[PDB]
Amino acid sequence: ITGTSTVGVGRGVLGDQKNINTTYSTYYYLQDNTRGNGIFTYDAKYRTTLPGSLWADADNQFFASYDAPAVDAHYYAGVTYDYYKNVHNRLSYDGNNAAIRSSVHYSQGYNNAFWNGSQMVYGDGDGQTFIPLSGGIDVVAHELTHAVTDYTAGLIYQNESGAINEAISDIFGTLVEFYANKNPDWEIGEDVYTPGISGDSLRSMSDPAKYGDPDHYSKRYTGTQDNGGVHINSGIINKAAYLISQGGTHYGVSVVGIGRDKLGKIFYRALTQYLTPTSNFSQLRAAAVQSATDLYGSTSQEVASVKQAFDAVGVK
Numbered sequence: 001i002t003g004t005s006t007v008g009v010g011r012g013v014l015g016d017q018k019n020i021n022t023t024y025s026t027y028y029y030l031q032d033n034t035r036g037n038g039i040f041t042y043d044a045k046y047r048t049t050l051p052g053s054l055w056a057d058a059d060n061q062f063f064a065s066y067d068a069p070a071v072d073a074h075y076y077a078g079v080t081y082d083y084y085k086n087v088h089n090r091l092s093y094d095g096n097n098a099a100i101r102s103s104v105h106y107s108q109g110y111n112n113a114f115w116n117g118s119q120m121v122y123g124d125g126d127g128q129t130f131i132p133l134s135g136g137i138d139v140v141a142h143e144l145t146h147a148v149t150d151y152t153a154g155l156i157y158q159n160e161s162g163a164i165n166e167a168i169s170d171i172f173g174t175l176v177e178f179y180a181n182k183n184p185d186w187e188i189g190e191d192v193y194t195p196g197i198s199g200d201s202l203r204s205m206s207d208p209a210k211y212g213d214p215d216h217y218s219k220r221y222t223g224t225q226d227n228g229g230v231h232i233n234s235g236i237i238n239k240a241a242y243l244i245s246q247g248g249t250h251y252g253v254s255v256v257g258i259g260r261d262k263l264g265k266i267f268y269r270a271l272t273q274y275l276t277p278t279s280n281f282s283q284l285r286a287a288a289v290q291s292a293t294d295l296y297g298s299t300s301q302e303v304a305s306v307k308q309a310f311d312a313v314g315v316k
């Protein structure tokens with residue numbers, strides 16, 4: 001809608017207070033005009049028709065429990081946007097400041113979130129396995145990263161190419177979590193997963209195996225479930241990226257860590273200049289090698305670490 005840019009305040013899913021960019025025109029809307037062509041957050045009203053209604057509020061104060069997921073979806077999309085602009089000089093997911101749109105209160109008891117090709121979508125969780133999924137910044141940044149991947153490498157969402165797609169979303173979700181820097185970790189979804197159990201998460205990048213995901217290529221899933229294990233085999237790439245950044249010795253193979261920012265640079269470059277819709281793990285290894293070479297030189301420590309990290313997870 002057309003209006004003046006304004007600033008509201010609310011409480012997010014975890015009870016934390018934050019400012020949000022809104023637009024005023026009779027009502028206050030969750031429309032942030034400060035970022036590209038704007039960030040727009042919608043109410044799906046417990047149904048599955050999308051997007052639903054542009055979120056409208058009477059007083060620009062968002063402290064109702066019904067408001068919390070919208071507050072986080074709107075705010076964390078702004079954070080993710082800032083990451084791509086400030087760190088990789090990328091304007092929104094298409095690189096040309098596309099409007100970023102998200103719907104919350106999708107369905108009833110829906111324990112997931114997704115990018116539907118055009119927008120982000122967040123369930124409320126059933127209150128047991130999940131609370132409202134937009135509560136996790138790794139989750140938001142994971143979903144928005146799919147839009148990024150889909151406009152750039154266009155990794156097809158099955159088998160190894162799908163695993164790569166899912167891993168890139170875990171990687172940049174995590175890197176965005178660390179960018180916002182609020183007890184960040186190498187875990188995925190800890191903030192919105194199982195409110196009754198502390199310390200757990202949906203997936204782990206530092207220890208994929210913790211949750212039964214492969215941390216080495218010899219252990220890859222080869223069946224047909226999960227589109228050929230796109231959320232399972234991502235663990236092999238997640239561990240590679242964890243190693244690249246943090247270092248370690250994994251199955252006897254030592255890796256000298258190069259830190260988070262360099263991991264991001266290498267993987268952003270691979271994603272945007274070398275990956276294709278059909279790339280498999282082996283081609284991912286080359287893309288990352290070629291990226292690090294470009295960025296730091298063929299004799300660098302960086303290129304050396306990319307090689308050992310992929311050696312370590314069994315990817316040749």
Ligand SMILES: [Ca+2]
Pocket residue numbers: 057058059060061062063
């Ligand atoms: Ca209000």
Ligand SMILES: [Ca+2]
Pocket residue numbers: 177182183184185190191
């Ligand atoms: Ca965290």
Ligand SMILES: [Ca+2]
Pocket residue numbers: 138174177184185186187188189190
């Ligand atoms: Ca996390």
Ligand SMILES: [Ca+2]
Pocket residue numbers: 190193194195196197198199200201
């Ligand atoms: Ca938990």
Ligand SMILES: [Zn+2]
Pocket residue numbers: 142146166169
């Ligand atoms: Zn995903």
